[PDB]
Each structure stands twice: as structure tokens, then as C-alpha cells.
């Protein structure tokens, strides 16, 4: 008679999941786990319901200096991350330079609210022309103007007295102070805006000893202006003051920002826009909401985010070869 | 694979087996069916889950890039930043891919080992009382009823009871 039979073997199911090994690839398996995510919404979102600071076509310089076109940001709320275009076009309206701009942006990567306070009022300029510092390269509404947070002081009558102003951080939070120097094309322009021909700017703090002198040269009409405007910045510790003393080519700090919230943030070089959303992970290419430990979207991420690998397929085999 | 069990002397899988990865198929006078060895399947489930989570936790400490800017006279340090943040990415992507490949090959052969171990286990309990067909099955010289079947499965095969019976039944196979 045919005998009873015990047999030994394994399980097979309808899984078309394939996994790769060192010797064999595309091995069909009973159970597998994809460990890599490849899905993004394609739009900037809140992070912990905290809105991003979408600078749009404006730059960090124009936003902090007060470019007439960046007036949309005159008052910004708390942000999780700034979004700045690669080549923002609302930048220095008056051609010039920002001393250690990239460093200032690296410090901005660690802030999460700035409060703008008028350090020196624009009406505090009795000996000098305050509202005469407007230019055609900085248009606010098809008429002329300048950076809002800074004042382009100009001689009164035909006399530009020595400015000797001082501000003490009575505030317990550190302050961000920003000033500037106009570098004109000829000595006639010099004496026209600032009577005194030889001019100097003296900025002094506990860690600052600054003796600037305008550089007059035949430069070119960038933005229609051959003159330049070099901008400088520094951080004021509490119980600490900044002293300005200048006789010409002085761009006076009107507004200054305090570091009220020093959290964690980034500068996202992305051309996307706010999409009325909130996610736990944000990339320059979109937002990710994946429990998978890995991702392949963008190496620069913000928030609770997966790890980034430059791979296209990552699946772990959890079962055995399928029939 | 390394143990010759899956895709080897057991050339196929059981779609009818549903409750486990490894198990047995019986075919006695009373019926034929599939049962699953719950012990080996669990042990494998536990080991596999622990392997995945360990891999994930080891990967969790992985370099994370930060964005920085360098002016047109900081080209050398910009190149340094670029090459380093990408070299860490290269090293880490390799690490992940290679680990996946290796640990998968080892998971597959772990399943192979489990199947071969269970096969040898019952080959050792079913002694001269059973003929080894080679396809992954054993033919009982003495007829093994459902309870007798589970005895083989659960590991409580009281050989001596069927020892005399299957010895007498082997006598006839020995004399034709």
C-alpha cells in the first residue's frame, strides 16, 4: 500500500516584490520592506505649523536693509525657515557690497525671530538733511527712495557737521546694527552731498575699531549709478553700546533688529511658493511625510526628516524566495 | 542556497501553506493538508524584525548636510565644502546599499538554513521507520495517523510504538 507522507517545505505567495543581493539581483521574495522614500508634495510648507519666510524675489540684504521693493516684509513673524531664490532681483538697489554677507546668513541660520527697533530716529537729524537721501536706483513707487532701515544723510545748507551719535543695548537681547558708506565718482559729488572734501567714518564697540574712508574712482553705472555703497554690520551685546562719528559719506542706522528668538532655521535656495500646508519634513523640492528611514529627494532638509542617500532603490528582504 | 534546501531538493513553494514560512505537508489515509511549524516561523519573524530595526538604528547616525555660502574669492573653501558634504554622502550611500545587499543575502540563506534544519530534525526522528524520497518528503513504512502526524510535527514522535510495526513492515520490503 502507498504509505502516509510527511513533507518539508516553505511558503509562497502572490508577492511580486524583488530584492537584490551580492551574487543575484531581482530576486522575487515573499515579504520585503522598502526603506527609501521617493515622494514629495512639491511645495513649501509650515514646519510645526510655523510659516516659512518666503523672501520671494527679494534677497536677505534687501530685506534687512529695507529695499523699497521688499516692503512686503517690513514686519515679518516667526519662521521655521527662510526661502530665498537663487538670483533674487530685488537686491542692493544702489550698487555696492555687504561686508561678510555669507557669514551673516550663516548666523541667520540659527535665529527664529528678529524684532526691528528704530535705534536712531530719522527726525533726530537736525544738523543734516535726513529725507534728502533718495536715489533713482532705489525706486519706491515710480518716484525715488532708499533703503528704509538706513538713512542717506546729506549736508544741510552748505555745512555737514561732525556726527557723534551713540546707542546702548539697554535690551537684554543682542542687537544687529548695520551701517554703510557712499563711495562717489568725483570730488565734486563729494562736496555736493558732503561739503567736507576729506571724509571719515569711525565705528567703535568693545570688539570693533572701524576707520572707514570713502574710495573715489571712475566706476561704472551699475543700476545707473557709478557710485558704490559698502554696507557693514556687527552684533551688540547687552550692556554694550555702539559709537558712530562721521563727517561724510555716512549711511546712518535707523532701524536695527534684535534676536528675540534664537532657534533652528535654514536658508532654502528654492523657487517654490507657499502652498497652504504643514509638514514635518521640508526639502527645496517639496515636503516629505514618510516613516521610511531614508529618502532621495534633496541633500538639504529641514525638520524631522529621513536620511538622504543618492540611491534609486533600497528594499530589505524580510521573507524567502517566492516560487 | 548555501544549505541546498530552498530551490534545491525542495524545488518549489507551497501557496496553500498560509500560516507560516516553514512547515509540513501530510498525506495519510485520512486526509492531506498543510501545517506550519510555528516555532521556526516565529524565531525567524523575531530575528528578521530585529535585523531590520538594528540596521535602521545603525543608519540613524548619518551625516546631515547644511547649506552655506561663499563669495567669488572663497572658491577653494567652497570646493572643500562641496567635496566633503558629497564625499560623506558617497560613503554613506555606499554603506547603506552594501549593507542592504549583504544582509539580504544572509536573510535568504537564514530561511534556507531554517528549512534544512526542520528537514533534518524530522529525518532524525523518523528513523528506519521512514524512507527518504529525496524531494523533501518521507514515506512512513508504518501508516502514521493524524495524531501520529502531529507527533512528528510537534516533536513528540514516540518512535518505539511504531518501531516494531515499521520493522515488521520493513521486513516485507526487504523480502519483496
Amino acid at each position: 500500500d502507498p504509505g502516509d507522507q510527511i513533507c518539508i517545505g516553505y511558503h509562497a505567495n502572490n508577492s511580486t516584490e524583488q530584492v537584490d543581493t551580492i551574487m543575484e539581483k531581482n530576486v522575487t521574495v515573499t515579504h520585503a520592506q522598502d526603506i527609501l522614500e521617493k515622494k514629495h508634495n512639491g511645495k513649501l510648507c509650515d514646519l510645526d505649523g510655523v510659516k516659512p519666510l518666503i523672501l520671494r524675489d527679494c534677497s536677505v540684504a534687501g530685506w534687512l536693509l529695507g529695499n523699497p521693493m521688499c516692503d512686503e516684509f517690513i514686519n515679518v513673524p516667526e519662521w521655521s525657515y527662510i526661502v530665498e531664490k537663487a538670483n533674487p532681483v530685488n537686491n542692493l538697489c544702489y550698487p555696492g557690497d555687504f561686508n561678510d554677507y555669507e557669514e551673516l546668513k550663516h548666523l541667520l541660520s540659527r535665529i527664529n525671530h528678529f524684532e526691528k527697533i528704530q535705534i536712531i530716529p530719522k527726525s533726530s537729524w537736525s544738523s543734516h538733511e535726513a529725507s534728502l537721501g533718495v536715489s533713482s536706483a532705489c525706486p519706491y513707487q515710480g518716484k525715488s527712495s532708499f533703503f528704509r532701515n538706513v538713512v542717506w544723510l546729506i549736508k544741510k545748507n552748505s555745512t555737514y557737521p561732525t556726527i557723534k551719535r551713540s546707542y546702548n543695548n539697554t535690551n537684554q537681547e543682542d542687537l544687529l546694527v548695520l551701517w554703510g558708506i557712499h563711495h562717489p565718482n568725483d570730488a565734486a559729488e563729494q562736496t555736493k552731498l558732503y561739503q567736507n572734501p576729506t571724509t571719515y567714518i569711525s565705528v567703535g564697540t568693545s570688539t570693533l575699531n572701524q576707520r572707514l574712508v570713502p574710495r573715489i574712482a571712475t566706476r561704472s553705472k551699475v543700476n545707473g549709478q557709478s557710485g558704490r555703497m559698502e554696507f557693514f554690520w556687527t552684533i551688540l551685546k547687552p550692556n554694550d553700546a555702539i559709537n558712530f562719528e562721521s563727517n561724510g559719506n555716512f549711511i546712518a542706522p535707523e532701524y536695527a533688529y534684535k534676536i528675540v528668538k534664537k532657534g533652528d532655521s535654514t536658508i532654502m535656495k528654492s523657487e517654490l511658493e507657499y502652498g497652504n500646508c504643514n509638514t514635518k519634513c521640508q526639502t527645496p523640492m517639496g515636503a516629505i511625510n514618510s516613516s521610511m528611514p531614508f529618502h532621495n529627494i534633496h541633500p538639504l532638509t529641514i525638520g524631522e526628516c529621513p536620511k538622504y542617500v543618492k540611491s534609486n532603490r533600497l528594499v530589505l528582504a524580510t521573507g524567502l524566495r517566492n516560487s | 542556497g548555501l544549505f541546498g534546501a530552498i530551490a534545491g531538493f525542495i524545488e518549489g513553494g507551497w501557496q496553500g501553506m498560509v500560516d507560516g514560512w516553514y512547515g509540513y505537508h501530510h498525506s495519510n489515509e485520512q486526509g492531506s493538508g498543510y501545517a506550519a511549524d510555528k516555532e521556526s516561523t516565529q524565531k525567524a519573524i523575531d530575528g528578521v524584525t530585529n535585523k531590520v530595526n538594528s540596521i535602521i538604528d545603525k543608519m540613524n547616525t548619518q551625516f546631515e548636510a547644511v547649506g552655506r555660502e561663499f563669495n567669488n574669492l572663497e572658491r577653494r573653501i567652497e570646493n572643500l565644502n562641496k567635496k566633503m558634504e558629497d564625499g560623506f554622502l558617497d560613503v554613506w550611500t555606499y554603506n547603506a546599499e552594501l549593507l542592504v545587499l549583504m544582509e539580504n543575502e544572509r536573510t535568504l540563506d537564514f530561511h534556507d538554513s531554517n528549512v534544512k534544519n526542520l528537514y533534518d530534525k524530522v529525518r532524525l526522528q523518523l528513523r528506519d521507520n521512514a524512507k527518504e524520497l529525496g524531494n523533501g518528503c518521507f514515506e512512513f513504512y508504518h501508516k502514521c495517523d493524524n495524531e501520529c502526524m502531529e507527533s512528528v510535527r510537534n516533536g513528540t514522535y514516540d518512535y518505539p510504538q511504531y518501531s516494531e510495526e515499521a520493522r515488521l513492515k520493513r521486513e516485507e520490503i526487504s523480502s519483496g
Binding site: 515579504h31 524580510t318 | 507560516g20 516561523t41 519573524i45 528578521v48 530585529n50 531590520v52 530595526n53 535602521i56
Partner: peptide, 15 residues
Amino acid sequence: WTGDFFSSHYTVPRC
């Protein structure tokens, strides 16, 4: 992390 193999049959470890 729990992949949940053979549900209602085995206690996948890890939570």
C-alpha cells in the same frame, strides 16, 4: 517598526 508578517498568528517583536 513592525512589518506584521503572518498576522493574527505570530507576535512580531519590537512593539
